[PDB]
Design a protein around this ligand. Structure first.
Ligand SMILES: *[C@@H]1O[C@H](CO)[C@@H](O[C@@H]2O[C@H](CO)[C@@H](O[C@@H]3O[C@H](CO[C@H]4O[C@H](CO)[C@@H](O)[C@H](O)[C@@H]4O)[C@@H](O)[C@H](O[C@H]4O[C@H](CO)[C@@H](O)[C@H](O[C@H]5O[C@H](CO)[C@@H](O)[C@H](O)[C@@H]5O)[C@@H]4O)[C@@H]3O)[C@H](O)[C@H]2NC(C)=O)[C@H](O)[C@H]1NC(C)=O
Ligand SMILES: *[C@@H]1O[C@H](CO)[C@@H](O[C@@H]2O[C@H](CO)[C@@H](O)[C@H](O)[C@H]2NC(C)=O)[C@H](O)[C@H]1NC(C)=O
Ligand SMILES: *[C@@H]1O[C@H](CO)[C@@H](O[C@@H]2O[C@H](CO)[C@@H](O)[C@H](O)[C@H]2NC(C)=O)[C@H](O)[C@H]1NC(C)=O
Ligand SMILES: *[C@@H]1O[C@H](CO)[C@@H](O[C@@H]2O[C@H](CO)[C@@H](O)[C@H](O)[C@H]2NC(C)=O)[C@H](O)[C@H]1NC(C)=O
Ligand SMILES: *[C@@H]1O[C@H](CO)[C@@H](O[C@@H]2O[C@H](CO)[C@@H](O)[C@H](O)[C@H]2NC(C)=O)[C@H](O)[C@H]1NC(C)=O
Ligand SMILES: *[C@@H]1O[C@H](CO)[C@@H](O[C@@H]2O[C@H](CO)[C@@H](O)[C@H](O)[C@H]2NC(C)=O)[C@H](O)[C@H]1NC(C)=O
Ligand SMILES: *[C@@H]1O[C@H](CO)[C@@H](O[C@@H]2O[C@H](CO)[C@@H](O)[C@H](O)[C@H]2NC(C)=O)[C@H](O)[C@H]1NC(C)=O
Ligand SMILES: *[C@@H]1O[C@H](CO)[C@@H](O[C@@H]2O[C@H](CO)[C@@H](O)[C@H](O)[C@H]2NC(C)=O)[C@H](O)[C@H]1NC(C)=O
Ligand SMILES: *[C@@H]1O[C@H](CO)[C@@H](O[C@@H]2O[C@H](CO)[C@@H](O)[C@H](O)[C@H]2NC(C)=O)[C@H](O)[C@H]1NC(C)=O
Ligand SMILES: *[C@@H]1O[C@H](CO)[C@@H](O[C@@H]2O[C@H](CO)[C@@H](O)[C@H](O)[C@H]2NC(C)=O)[C@H](O)[C@H]1NC(C)=O
Ligand SMILES: *[C@@H]1O[C@H](CO)[C@@H](O[C@@H]2O[C@H](CO)[C@@H](O)[C@H](O)[C@H]2NC(C)=O)[C@H](O)[C@H]1NC(C)=O
Ligand SMILES: *[C@@H]1O[C@H](CO)[C@@H](O[C@@H]2O[C@H](CO)[C@@H](O)[C@H](O)[C@H]2NC(C)=O)[C@H](O)[C@H]1NC(C)=O
Ligand SMILES: *[C@@H]1O[C@H](CO)[C@@H](O[C@@H]2O[C@H](CO)[C@@H](O)[C@H](O)[C@H]2NC(C)=O)[C@H](O)[C@H]1NC(C)=O
Ligand SMILES: *[C@@H]1O[C@H](CO)[C@@H](O[C@@H]2O[C@H](CO)[C@@H](O)[C@H](O)[C@H]2NC(C)=O)[C@H](O)[C@H]1NC(C)=O
Ligand SMILES: *[C@@H]1O[C@H](CO)[C@@H](O)[C@H](O)[C@H]1NC(C)=O
Ligand SMILES: *[C@@H]1O[C@H](CO)[C@@H](O)[C@H](O)[C@H]1NC(C)=O
Ligand SMILES: *[C@@H]1O[C@H](CO)[C@@H](O)[C@H](O)[C@H]1NC(C)=O
Ligand SMILES: *[C@@H]1O[C@H](CO)[C@@H](O)[C@H](O)[C@H]1NC(C)=O
Ligand SMILES: *[C@@H]1O[C@H](CO)[C@@H](O)[C@H](O)[C@H]1NC(C)=O
Ligand SMILES: *[C@@H]1O[C@H](CO)[C@@H](O)[C@H](O)[C@H]1NC(C)=O
Lengths: 534, 48, 53
């Protein structure tokens, strides 16, 4: 008939994309360097009706973004404080007055004067000291040890990741969603919930719970090279303690440089440990196994302790009160499944190497007084051995963050598109995504306004401006530099689409339309420009 | 040459030293567009 | 004033921090600094002779 190409700007469609997210948050906490903005007290969420979106938590790049930011916050926080290089001296370690794993070591240090030395004493844990005037600190032949800045807390603070202009974060609200495939209930959020950067290994602590059942999710449930994340719908409490009453002693190493050493232990020498109720753990496993037999045939399932390797892998590690615990979980993962209190002994280390980075040790100063913390086991990390065998494990931190970020996806908004019309020359952002084209075209200002809304942030902002200007330059070239709806003189070709006006405007959505003419947009764009020059 | 103006107009937009170069390219573009808006023809390559 | 008693004396800040010497070629003589407004902003000046704070 007489249909013409009409250009619409601010169209609610999107394509998958990677970008830089900014944090939002709400002393001297290690996770609060204030490189990022405060949160909005009332974040918005818009349910997109009739939107199906394919998610894949294993390919999610928000995970890589979080992992990198976490490492940087940690490293920035350790820069402004004392190096323990001066302590790499021979230690004389004995056990003369401690027990009837902790050594009493004497050594020579300098004072604030470079011409003077004194003999001092400190207690060290056996795991931090290696034999060679008998002993050496464990990392003196590898690297310099930085002590944790003493006023910095390691207690996690929820971090929200929020989208930059031109982008949106979609959230999957399917209660049974495992991690991949279509989500039938998708909402747009300004940003994520707060995610606590809790560091742990075999058991995931203080995370989110599943709402209906235990969800077992993996990239490939039949592989052995992939880990399995098990999300519980009920928490199990774990009570951990450090029963020794340690005294902190302050040793002057240099001109304003203090070292914090463990002084005498008051009272009994006792072993650190964690308490898990016996019945709650057993109910948890009955449920985990019941749901594991839904992926595996009806085979005997056995749980074993991990096979070996570094303490950071074989034990359950965590930061409790600022001390670093390495707990033995062989008391949990030791059972066979077919058709009281658990006490886990723990070790404490002061010299640690986080995120598996060799050559960058940190010394955690001792914390004075007794320590107790109560954590929630909210999930497990399991691995299959080559009857099925499962062992706890995986020291790769990205698998912890995948358990919180699995619901989120980042997409880029693609505001420009065309459709045939007969002219001739409040839902909120993306709320109209599920609306038909003839309804969604009435809310174009909503998306157009969201295109403008350190170095990584300057690059993101400069680029958002450049993207905006390139689209405006293009519209100026085609004509209608100031319009959201622009009628052109290019006749519509029924070969691009032979759908009627009612089929296009009353039934279809913009997201579907974008697919129907995806192979013709370069032709159409060239015709619009060529016709302007005539 | 007046028939190939879009070719050059598109090439006006196409560490710290690079951010300064990019911020400045944007500012130069906008100053020329502001000037055209003042003269008239804010959206045109050829303005009578 | 720079030395404190404790082989008798110590520099005054050796138990507190590291002392950086000034660069011997760097003058401390003040140079007038003018502050200027960025685009979108203006600086207003008050010219009342008896104006107080
Ligand atoms: C999972 O989520 C769980 C719940 O959030 C976490 O458990 C919680 O972990 C936090 C941090 O470890 C625990 O909070 C600590 O509690 C200590 C004891 O407080 C008690 O006694 C106080 C006495 O005054 C009282 O006021 C409290 O109300 C409470 O009764 C606190 O001492 C500790 O304080 C730390 O932070 C303070 C911030 O201002 C700081 O001032 C403190 O300084 C003191 O200690 C330093 C040590 O060097 C000294 O130098 C100072 O001079 C001073 O003595 C100190 O830094 C903090 O509040 C929380 O209690 C615990 N909850 C439960 C139920 O136990 C889990 O840990 C999470 N899981 C994981 C893996 O993270
Ligand atoms: C689809 O997902 C949305 C978002 O989670 C659900 O909407 C929430 O429903 C609860 C039920 O009371 C409300 O309390 C929340 O305030 C709603 N959130 C929003 C953003 O509106 C919705 O119920 C889900 N629909 C289905 C069929 O599961
Ligand atoms: C390392 O410490 C031990 C601690 O026993 C020292 O051995 C003896 O310690 C007693 C403690 O009263 C002294 O009376 C002895 O004289 C010490 N032995 C000797 C041979 O002197 C040990 O000497 C210390 N070594 C170093 C290098 O400090
Ligand atoms: C630095 O010293 C440590 C401690 O002696 C060395 O670590 C040991 O390396 C051997 C190599 O076979 C292992 O068998 C030991 O189990 C390791 N000990 C510990 C405590 O882990 C380390 O290799 C040395 N590094 C260098 C560069 O020589
Ligand atoms: C998570 O749920 C998805 C969706 O059902 C599963 O994906 C399907 O897996 C089967 C396995 O044979 C495939 O045949 C289907 O084609 C997949 N569907 C899609 C949309 O890709 C996924 O396997 C589940 N995850 C786990 C660990 O079981
Ligand atoms: C550990 O799990 C317990 C529940 O078993 C959490 O306690 C309650 O959690 C609900 C969640 O909606 C809150 O509404 C209640 O107010 C909480 N109880 C109390 C006394 O506040 C507990 O908060 C969980 N701990 C962690 C670290 O998540
Ligand atoms: C999930 O893992 C299974 C098991 O490793 C993969 O199936 C194997 O694929 C290789 C390809 O060379 C075959 O040689 C094996 O014989 C297959 N094993 C079985 C049991 O059939 C499967 O392809 C993986 N799926 C994905 C999506 O990665
Ligand atoms: C751990 O040891 C410290 C030091 O002994 C105890 O704290 C107090 O220290 C002062 C120092 O003069 C004593 O006068 C107090 O009497 C000590 N407290 C008590 C209750 O006697 C600290 O309380 C001990 N910690 C625990 C949990 O017992
Ligand atoms: C971990 O600690 C918590 C609280 O410190 C324990 O919870 C208490 O358990 C007793 C059991 O009789 C109840 O009477 C209390 O009312 C509970 N307190 C609260 C605040 O709920 C928990 O049982 C401990 N877990 C283990 C394994 O010992
Ligand atoms: C966790 O604790 C268990 C025992 O509670 C340790 O297992 C023992 O390891 C020694 C090492 O030679 C063996 O001789 C014992 O026979 C083992 N006991 C059992 C019951 O098999 C285990 O090694 C500890 N794991 C870690 C990581 O410390
Ligand atoms: C897993 O649990 C079983 C029992 O539930 C442990 O079996 C014990 O093995 C030791 C080995 O010397 C025997 O002396 C005990 O008598 C056995 N106990 C029973 C009840 O038969 C097994 O060792 C545990 N595995 C681990 C790694 O701790
Ligand atoms: C999601 O799809 C449903 C079903 O097509 C839409 O509901 C229709 O909305 C139109 C709006 O004019 C009504 O005239 C129809 O009567 C509704 N159908 C039914 C069965 O009630 C719904 O509006 C769509 N969501 C969005 C955002 O457009
Ligand atoms: C510090 O300087 C004083 C300066 O008088 C030294 O004292 C005596 O100085 C005279 C100078 O000719 C010498 O002849 C004496 O022999 C010095 N006294 C002694 C006991 O030797 C003083 O010794 C100096 N001290 C140090 C540590 O340098
Ligand atoms: C470093 O040494 C200086 C010099 O002794 C200390 O400064 C003195 O501190 C006392 C504290 O009561 C004052 O009364 C003196 O008047 C101070 N002396 C001077 C010259 O100001 C300083 O406090 C020491 N610093 C540390 C960290 O111990
Ligand atoms: C400290 O230095 C003195 C100097 O003689 C030496 O005798 C002593 O053994 C040294 N201490 C240690 C632990 O090396
Ligand atoms: C410490 O030195 C003594 C000296 O005889 C030696 O007997 C002992 O075995 C040494 N211990 C270590 C850990 O080297
Ligand atoms: C957790 O899942 C199990 C699976 O049967 C269910 O029986 C239990 O009631 C669920 N718990 C909650 C809190 O929904
Ligand atoms: C856990 O369940 C198993 C099932 O065989 C049972 O034998 C074991 O005694 C149970 N443990 C507790 C603490 O009830
Ligand atoms: C449709 O495409 C064909 C391809 O040759 C072209 O000849 C025809 O003129 C086009 N029609 C419109 C309306 O552009
Ligand atoms: C310096 O050392 C001498 C040694 O006898 C002492 O008499 C004098 O009082 C000391 N002076 C100071 C400032 O310490």
């Amino acid at each position: 008939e007489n249909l013409w190409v009409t250009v619409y700007y601010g169209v609610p469609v999107w394509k998958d994309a990677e970008t830089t997210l900014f944090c939002a948050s709400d002393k001297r906490n290690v996770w609060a360097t204030h490189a990022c903005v405060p949160t909005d007290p009332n974040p918005q969420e818009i349910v997109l009706e009739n939107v199906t979106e394919n998610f894949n938590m294993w390919k999610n790049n928000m995970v890589e973004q979080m992992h990198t930011d976490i490492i940087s916050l940690w490293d920035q926080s350790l820069k402004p404080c004392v190096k323990l290089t001066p302590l790499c001296v021979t230690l004389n370690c004995t056990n003369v007055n401690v027990t009837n794993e902790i050594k009493n070591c004497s050594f020579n240090i300098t004072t604030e004067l470079r011409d003077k030395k004194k003999k001092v004493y400190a207690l060290f844990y056996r795991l931090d000291v290696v034999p060679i005037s008998n002993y050496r600190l464990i990392n003196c032949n590898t690297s310099a040890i930085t002590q944790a800045c003493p006023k910095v807390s390691f207690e996690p603070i929820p971090i929200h990741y929020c989208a930059p202009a031109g982008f949106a974060i979609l959230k999957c609200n399917d209660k049974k969603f495992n991690g991949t495939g279509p989500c039938k209930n998708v909402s747009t959020v300004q940003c994520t919930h707060g995610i606590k950067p809790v560091v742990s290994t075999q058991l995931l602590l203080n995370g989110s719970l599943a709402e209906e059942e235990i969800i077992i999710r993996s990239e490939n449930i039949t592989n052995n090279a992939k880990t399995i994340i098990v999300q519980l719908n009920e928490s199990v409490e774990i009570n951990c303690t450090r029963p020794n009453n340690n005294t902190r002693k302050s040793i002057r190493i240099g001109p304003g440089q203090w070292f914090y050493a463990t002084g005498d232990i008051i009272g009994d020498i006792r072993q650190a440990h964690c308490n898990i109720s016996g019945t709650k753990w057993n109910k948890t496993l009955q449920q985990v196994v019941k749901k594991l037999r839904e992926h595996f045939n009806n085979k005997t399932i056995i749980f074993n302790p991990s096979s070996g390797g570094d303490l950071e892998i074989t034990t359950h590690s965590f930061n409790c009160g600022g001390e670093f615990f390495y707990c033995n979980t062989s008391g949990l993962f030791n059972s066979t499944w077919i058709g009281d209190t658990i006490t886990l002994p723990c070790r404490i280390k002061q010299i640690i190497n986080m995120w598996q980075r060799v050559g960058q040790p940190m010394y955690a100063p001792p914390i004075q007084g007794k320590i107790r913390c109560v954590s929630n086991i909210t999930g497990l990390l399991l691995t299959r051995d080559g009857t099925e065998t499962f062992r706890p494990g995986g020291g790769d931190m990205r698998d912890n963050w995948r358990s919180e970020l699995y619901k989120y996806k980042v997409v880029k908004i693609e505001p420009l598109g065309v459709a045939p019309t007969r002219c001739k020359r409040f839902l909120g952002f993306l709320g109209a995504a599920g609306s038909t084209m003839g309804a969604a075209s009435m809310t174009l200002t909503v998306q157009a306004r969201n295109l403008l809304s350190g170095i990584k942030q300057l690059q993101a902002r400069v680029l958002a401006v450049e993207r905006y200007l390139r689209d405006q330059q293009l519209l100026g070239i085609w004509g209608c530099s100031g319009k959201l709806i622009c009628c052109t003189n290019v006749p519509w070709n029924s070969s691009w689409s032979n759908k009627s006006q009612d089929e296009i405007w009353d039934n279809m959505t913009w997201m579907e339309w974008d697919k129907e003419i995806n192979n013709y947009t370069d032709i159409i764009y060239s015709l619009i420009e060529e016709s302007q020059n005539q």
